[PDB]
Design a protein that fits this description.
The structure is cut from a larger assembly and holds 3 copies of chain A. Chain A contains 1 helix and 31 strands. Chain A is mainly β and 520 residues long. The first copy, chain A, has a single domain, classed as Empty Capsid Viral Protein 2, CATH 2.170.30.10. In chain A, strands 1, 2, 5, 6, 8, 13 and 30 form a 7-stranded mixed beta sheet that branches. The longest helix of chain A is centred in the first third of the chain and has 8 residues. The first copy, chain A, is elongated, with a radius of gyration of 29 Å. The complex binds 2'-deoxyadenosine-5'-monophosphate (2 copies). The site of one 2'-deoxyadenosine-5'-monophosphate has 8 residues of chain B, from β28. Chains A, B: It is found in: Virion.
Chain lengths: 520, 520, 123
């Protein structure tokens, strides 16, 4: 693709249409790119004795990058509703990436006024980490994605990565990556950038909730043919009746004693919190009493753990200590914001396959009972994996992460990103972008010294992203209507998912995905 | 179709599947048929001086008939939800009718016990009024349709019709119809009946609500270029300023004064009622104060009138005196039942095209104002049809009527059935059914007298009805989610649209159709 | 009416700066503009309401292009749940630089001739 100055290098493709078996979303946004790090690679690390479990070492690059690992980058609210309310599941298929209508602007502070002018001969550099040789910094819920609202212009994030570290120091096996050591396409105004990607085979997401329960699985009307022991001593308690071994045949009556075929999913107990700031202990325990793990003598918070339900029946006020994902409302400090300023996600559809996050797991025996010894019971707060266990995964939300790169290790278990979504061995590659350095006035005499005098300039253009989604259609013989997402028909102030009096788009609530029901 | 005794003449086809562009519903039920009128055609009429506006004359036939002019005959609740929440509109296309697995039983009261036995050699008679030579008695919301619940067995309705009448007497131009004078197929056990029908071109129903309003149609930001007169006297009211003619250019400000292009629909004011039995007048006025019409000196209640909205904004408690359709809950006297026993339908989606039923229509002038005469205003309570008028039609409900035969007259206006649905010149024909008379013991001596001694017997079998529906797909660029029908996720007593403790199916609420939104 | 041909061309994008007390206006050659047509009528039709901003009766007159706004469903100053929000960035649109242009053709439907006459008789 090569055209002229007064000729656009692309069009605005922002649309979505459905094919009953699949859906194609196209999304275009306007982007702006500054000059990060002053065209310099800078070594970064932790403050000399500021914190210990936060010690780190890495580098900062003059490169920006494109991100669209959020669902609202592609699905308008209305669309998300069509998807959510009609499909057993869904997944990604293809991807088309396009950069175009590029403009390079250089600015000058002459006196007390900034003039901005065109630098037509200036270039910009783009490339894609398709061999995954660069540290994958996406799928970490960072900021700088495409604006949920198409009319919103966004700033392109800067690229930085972390390496291996011993405290604030580094090791010998630490890796330094130069992005100038990658072949990249240079673009002038009227040039453009093309890219296509094909997702791998990754299971459909669960856009459903089970209409049965792991324990309420059998026939309510018939008794089993298996027997269990329910009386160890209790007999005809009158004369000469100390103890006896008695067995009962399973019945719809003994519903939680019947022989079973499957187990609930794994668990890692979280601490229970209440939204009412007075049910809780008068202490500050978000760290000393929260669940966590430690690698190399460094404690890390187990924020979203295994998929566990948020609360039990008849509660809805108790949420796991960070046992779920939380989104911040529009306009809310990054530092200690009120509970009325954030949006907490309820995972109450998986109550049927998974243990509750705050509750125990079950009961294990740990002794050899006899006439001499009384049988001991121990509450299990942590459960690894077991043959027979089944479970559901974390939901995805309109503004949640989509995919995540699966770490290249010797072993994985259930490679589904813990924050939710699609785990990929080879995910959509990273798209790097940066303004090419333009030297200012050079000396008539030759100076070997590092060149530091540059013309200040930023870039702007459009970006387009087209993704094809495969849908799993609903096939239910449920007679009664199912629950659907819907807006309040009530006379309301502002309209949900809209701009306000002074033009600011805002998403009212987090949107789940499990509205339709399937059987176990 | 001709088979044997020990061989079924058909299968149970009760299913529905979607084709994205259309939907096919198949419905099978078990039916029973008695011997109506004792195999006799009886002349019926009004009680000698019982009532005047209810005077009538007609006949009663020994024939039964099949009816499925209700939506719940075909759509399960879940299906209705899929249709309602996804489609701009819909309509009927084809029809397949089948009678099979017929059994004729004859009963005898010997002493004090009734024995029921098989009459294998007995027949039954079926035919279809395809030339519409018989009075069309369907589309009048009668009872005896197919049970909403497939497991429910139903009794087949008896056929009767009305003719022309002068009070309780009849005229010379009155018509007597014998159904034995129609060619009909006679069926033994193992015989069956086949029938196929194709609907005519009838507009899609409105499964949508307008997102704009007839009066809020223009640009909020720009002023018109047309001028109106808004001041007749009011001027610089100080000295020597009695009156003057002043004109203002239309603005977003003068929003209800701007020149217009269209009118709201027609109207026929209904009386306003409140659900709170104490806001109302302490009188009994459901007849003396309700809207009605009269043909041939006979007052008839204008029950569902032209499509008019039920209530204005911020009310929802005032419903038009019978200005809408009302469904009776499961198990509720046909005679004076409480308000908590019926289900009233709210027509509040057509607020944007239609006048309110209880409110006035508008304002008309009726004098020649001058300095001598003060300008008079008259409130218009009744409005015929006008060039420029636009409107919406009555909604259809899961348990509402589907179609209605359009009377064969010289003139029609908007041939949409007033109770709602599809008006057809040539609707699905009537399917008559009756047990063939079986004479009992005859005298060894010849008697000319009318034969009256018959063997008592009834019939039973299955009936199947397959209808193909064309769908109009949703194509909206609405950004925010639309309102959808959904069930209460709340911990509930009984499940909506279900059988209860003693097996009785019950529909909780009337279901509209206008959930999705389209522009004007 | 029968047919229609629409064309946009000779486009110029100007950017202005208030530096001190004087406004300088200069060419932004690399700047674009976005055009599209609501051919599926998915956007509220705001024409045919006698608004202003049409083409000048006199060809020599230059005109300012009107701004787009629409009304939805409302209960007083408040809105309802069935109210519709339309984003025009969610429509595929052609982007034009200087030297690009826009083409469009339309065919009217069968609509009766207007009455350019008066009856010489009376009912
Ligand atoms: N997001 C995602 N990506 C890939 N696989 C998933 C995912 N979620 C669940 N699984 C399941 C599907 C396979 O049966 C299994 C492969 O594990 P393996 O370790 O590859 O043998 O992991
Ligand atoms: N249910 C139904 N059936 C038929 N036509 C309908 C119906 N609802 C609205 N209309 C409209 C469609 C045609 O433009 C018009 C024909 O009227 P005519 O009197 O036939 O010239 O009536």
């Amino acid at each position: 693709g090569a055209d002229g100055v007064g000729n656009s290098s692309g069009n605005w493709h922002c649309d979505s249409q459905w094919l009953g078996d699949r859906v194609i979303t196209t999304s275009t946004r306007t982007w702006a790119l500054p000059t990060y790090n002053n065209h310099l690679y800078k070594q970064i690390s932790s403050q000399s004795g500021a914190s210990n479990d936060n010690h780190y070492f890495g580098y900062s690059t003059p490169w920006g990058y494109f991100d669209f690992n959020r669902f609202h980058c592609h699905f308008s609210p209305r669309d998300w509703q069509r998807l959510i309310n009609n499909n057993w599941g869904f997944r990604p298929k293809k991807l088309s990436f396009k950069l175009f209508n590029i403009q390079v602007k250089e600015v000058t502070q002459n006196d007390g006024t900034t003039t901005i002018a065109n630098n037509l001969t200036s270039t910009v550099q783009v490339f894609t980490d398709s061999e995954y040789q660069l540290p994958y910094v996406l799928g970490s819920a960072h900021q700088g994605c495409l604006p949920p609202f198409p009319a919103d212009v966004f700033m392109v994030p800067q690229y930085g990565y972390l390496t291996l570290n011993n405290g604030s120091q580094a090791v010998g096996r630490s890796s330094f990556y130069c992005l100038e050591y990658f072949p990249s396409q240079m673009l002038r105004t009227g040039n453009n950038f093309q890219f296509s990607y094909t997702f791998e085979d990754v299971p459909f997401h669960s856009s459903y909730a089970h209409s049965q329960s792991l324990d309420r699985l059998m026939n309510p009307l018939i008794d089993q043919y298996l027997y269990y022991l329910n009386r160890t001593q209790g007999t005809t308690s009158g004369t000469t009746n100390q103890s006896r071994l008695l067995f009962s045949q399973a019945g719809p009556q003994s519903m939680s004693l019947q022989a079973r075929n499957w187990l609930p999913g794994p668990c890692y107990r979280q601490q229970r919190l209440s939204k009412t700031a007075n049910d809780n202990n008068n202490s500050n325990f978000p760290w000393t009493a929260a669940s966590k793990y430690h690698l190399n003598g460094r404690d890390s918070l187990v924020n979203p753990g295994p998929a566990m339900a948020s609360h039990k029946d008849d509660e809805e006020k108790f949420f796991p200590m960070h046992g779920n994902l939380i989104f911040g409302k529009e306009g809310t400090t990054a530092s200690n914001a009120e509970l009325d300023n954030v949006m907490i996600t309820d995972e109450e559809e998986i109550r049927t396959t998974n243990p509750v996050a705050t509750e125990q797991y079950g009961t294990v025996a740990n002794n050899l009972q006899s006439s001499n010894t009384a049988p001991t019971t121990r509450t299990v707060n942590d459960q690894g994996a077991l043959p027979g266990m089944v479970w559901q995964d974390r939901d995805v939300y309109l503004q949640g992460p989509i995919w995540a790169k699966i770490p290249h290790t010797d072993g994985h278990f259930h490679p589904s990103p813990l924050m939710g979504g699609f785990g990929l061995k080879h995910p959509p590659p990273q798209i790097m972008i940066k303004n090419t350095p333009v030297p200012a006035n050079p000396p008539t005499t030759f100076s070997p010294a590092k060149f530091a005098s540059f013309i200040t300039q930023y870039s702007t253009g459009q970006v387009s992203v087209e993704i094809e989604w495969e849908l799993q259609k609903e096939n239910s013989k449920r007679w009664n209507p199912e629950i659907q997402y819907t807006s309040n028909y009530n006379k309301s102030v502002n309209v949900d998912f809209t701009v306000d009096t002074n033009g600011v788009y805002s998403e009212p609530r987090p949107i789940g995905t499990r509205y339709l029901t399937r059987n176990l």
